[PDB]
Amino acid sequence: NSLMERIHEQIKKGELALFYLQEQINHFEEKPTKEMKDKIVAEMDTIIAMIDGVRGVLDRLMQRKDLDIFEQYNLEMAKKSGDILERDLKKEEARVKKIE
Amino acid sequence: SLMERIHEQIKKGELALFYLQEQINHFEEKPTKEMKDKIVAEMDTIIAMIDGVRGVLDRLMQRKDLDIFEQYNLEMAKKSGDILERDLKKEEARVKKIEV
Amino acid sequence: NSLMERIHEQIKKGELALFYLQEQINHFEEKPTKEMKDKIVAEMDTIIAMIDGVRGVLDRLMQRKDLDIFEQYNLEMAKKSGDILERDLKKEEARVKKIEV
Amino acid sequence: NSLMERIHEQIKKGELALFYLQEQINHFEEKPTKEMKDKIVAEMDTIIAMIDGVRGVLDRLMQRKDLDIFEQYNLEMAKKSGDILERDLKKEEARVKKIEV
Amino acid sequence: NSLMERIHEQIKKGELALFYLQEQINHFEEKPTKEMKDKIVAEMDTIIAMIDGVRGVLDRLMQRKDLDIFEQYNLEMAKKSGDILERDLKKEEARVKKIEV
Amino acid sequence: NSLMERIHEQIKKGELALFYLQEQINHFEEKPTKEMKDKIVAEMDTIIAMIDGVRGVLDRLMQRKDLDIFEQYNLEMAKKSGDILERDLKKEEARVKKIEV
Numbered sequence: 001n002s003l004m005e006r007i008h009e010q011i012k013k014g015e016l017a018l019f020y021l022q023e024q025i026n027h028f029e030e031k032p033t034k035e036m037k038d039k040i041v042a043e044m045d046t047i048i049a050m051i052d053g054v055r056g057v058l059d060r061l062m063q064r065k066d067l068d069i070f071e072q073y074n075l076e077m078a079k080k081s082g083d084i085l086e087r088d089l090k091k092e093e094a095r096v097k098k099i100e
Numbered sequence: 101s102l103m104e105r106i107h108e109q110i111k112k113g114e115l116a117l118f119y120l121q122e123q124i125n126h127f128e129e130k131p132t133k134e135m136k137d138k139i140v141a142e143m144d145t146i147i148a149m150i151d152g153v154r155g156v157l158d159r160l161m162q163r164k165d166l167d168i169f170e171q172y173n174l175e176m177a178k179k180s181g182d183i184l185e186r187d188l189k190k191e192e193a194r195v196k197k198i199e200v
Numbered sequence: 201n202s203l204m205e206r207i208h209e210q211i212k213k214g215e216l217a218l219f220y221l222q223e224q225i226n227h228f229e230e231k232p233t234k235e236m237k238d239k240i241v242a243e244m245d246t247i248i249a250m251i252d253g254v255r256g257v258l259d260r261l262m263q264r265k266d267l268d269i270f271e272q273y274n275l276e277m278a279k280k281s282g283d284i285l286e287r288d289l290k291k292e293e294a295r296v297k298k299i300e301v
Numbered sequence: 302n303s304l305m306e307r308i309h310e311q312i313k314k315g316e317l318a319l320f321y322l323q324e325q326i327n328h329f330e331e332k333p334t335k336e337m338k339d340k341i342v343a344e345m346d347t348i349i350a351m352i353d354g355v356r357g358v359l360d361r362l363m364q365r366k367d368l369d370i371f372e373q374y375n376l377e378m379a380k381k382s383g384d385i386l387e388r389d390l391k392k393e394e395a396r397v398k399k400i401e402v
Numbered sequence: 403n404s405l406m407e408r409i410h411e412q413i414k415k416g417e418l419a420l421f422y423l424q425e426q427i428n429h430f431e432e433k434p435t436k437e438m439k440d441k442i443v444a445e446m447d448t449i450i451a452m453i454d455g456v457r458g459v460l461d462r463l464m465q466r467k468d469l470d471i472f473e474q475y476n477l478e479m480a481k482k483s484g485d486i487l488e489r490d491l492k493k494e495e496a497r498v499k500k501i502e503v
Numbered sequence: 504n505s506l507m508e509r510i511h512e513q514i515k516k517g518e519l520a521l522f523y524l525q526e527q528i529n530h531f532e533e534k535p536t537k538e539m540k541d542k543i544v545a546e547m548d549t550i551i552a553m554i555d556g557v558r559g560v561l562d563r564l565m566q567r568k569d570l571d572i573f574e575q576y577n578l579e580m581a582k583k584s585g586d587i588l589e590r591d592l593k594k595e596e597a598r599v600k601k602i603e604v
Binding site for chain 6: 405406408409410412413414415416417419420421444445447448451452455456458459462463466468469470473476479480483486487490
């Protein structure tokens with residue numbers, strides 16, 4: 001386990017939070033409102049803010065000597081995942097701003 | 101797609117946690133200074149990631165354009181967040197308090 | 201909290217579910233889609249079927265002859281509030297069904 | 302809306318009703334009497350019975366198709382948290398009966 | 403309504419308190435305990451305090467010049483009701499206190 | 504026994520006092536007059552003054568130390584119902600005054 005299941009449920013929320021953001025964008029495109037843009041953009045800057053600090057924490061943990069071939073892999077995957085997401089966010093966010 | 105990749109990446113994050121658990125299980129068998137140092141170092145990183153997300157929630161829970169449903173969903177995520185982080189912190193202390 | 205803490209938030213969810221329904225109806229009047237009509241109605245019938253079930257349970261408890269005046273009061277209020285909510289639901293569901301779509 | 306304003310007030314009343322039950326259990330432990338246990342158990346069996354009526358409600362919805370991602374997830378948690386809540390209730394009730402008088 | 407029905411409810415609240423009080427005293431007489439006595443005395447003191455406060459308001463109102471025969475009578479009755487209630491409450495309070503625990 | 508009965512009828516008086524007022528306002532519209540207007544004004548004024556005074560008393564009571572959640576809630580509701588009532592009174596009176604007489 002339950003100790004692990006707890007974390008999983010918490011992570012699943014973040015995933016659904018992205019789906020929701022995607023829905024907000026969809027609703028925005030339909031009926032564009034400056035008020036909604038302010039919301040979406042802020043939220044996107046929020047997610048990016050977290051990833052920024054998170055990446056740092058990872059870069060530090062990877063500079064250890066204990067990490068084995070398996071542990072090293074996981075960290076590299078998490079670091080890359082954050083990169084992929086943050087890139088696809090700033091790219092998407094920039095598009096929203098371009099929407100008149 | 102992106103969401104298809106986010107889900108795939110998230111699944112890997114789960115498998116990573118199950119591995120950490122097995123190294124804790126292995127540590128209960130042969131409590132050593134080396135493994136303990138690694139585990140603790142990894143538990144710190146995880147807790148930090150949560151503590152970080154915790155700070156992101158607060159920044160959002162201050163806006164005005166938040167309907168009752170969004171506010172509630174966040175308050176729940178934060179309440180649950182503090183619970184999970186509190187459970188992990190107590191779990192780490194139990195690890196840092198073991199002899200060889 | 202203990203059980204009361206959980207029971208409380210559990211009831212809080214019910215309150216939100218209502219406001220959520222209000223939104224379904226509020227937006228339904230904007231674009232009367234029969235696809236949503238069949239959906240909303242189903243939800244209302246579910247809640248009503250739940251209330252009707254709760255009443256039967258409240259009636260059995262009120263049958264006891266060892267409840268203090270305050271306990272009797274709370275049971276009457278609970279049953280009454282349920283009776284009120286069901287009135288407004290059936291009167292609203294009837295109006296919704298009238299909207300062609 | 303006055304209705305939701307009244308429902309909200311009723312929730313506050315029901316909240317006090319639950320806390321009042323808490324006190325009953327407290328004093329019950331202090332001075333364990335048979336007659337009190339009977340009423341407390343009956344009151345909890347009622348609270349549990351209501352939850353059983355909630356599950357049959359959720360299940361009926363969790364089978365529906367026109368539910369989206371968010372709606373389906375919200376109910377799924379309500380059912381899980383509901384099961385745990387009810388489970389904890391039955392456990393709390395057992396502890397009460399165990400207190401012989 | 404959403405007003406007169408709400409008022410109707412808040413009115414019955416006063417009677418509920420008194421009825422509940424009479425039950426507390428009854429239960430106390432059956433099983434006297436310092437905990438309950440102190441609780442009953444505290445409640446009565448508060449209720450009495452409310453009567454004393456209200457009496458002041460009623461007296462100030464009687465001074466009004468634009469009062470007709472009706473409004474004036476209603477005040478006298480409301481004033482006498484408090485006089486009776488407080489007179490009986492104090493007698494019951496003195497009696498309860500004298501009960502050995 | 505005669506006390507509770509007296510308090511009960513003392514309750515229905517305050518209830519009728521508002522309905523009787525509502526009827527006064529009704530007939531007034533049918534045939535406006537500077538006399539009924541001055542009377543109604545004084546009537547609605549006195550009631551408002553009462554609510555004001557009672558609130559002040561309710562504020563003092565809440566400052567007591569031996570109060571419990573149930574006593575605090577009763578006071579809160581008593582003060583709340585006083586606000587709503589007076590609110591409609593102040594508004595309604597305005598509508599009454601702005602009537603061509």
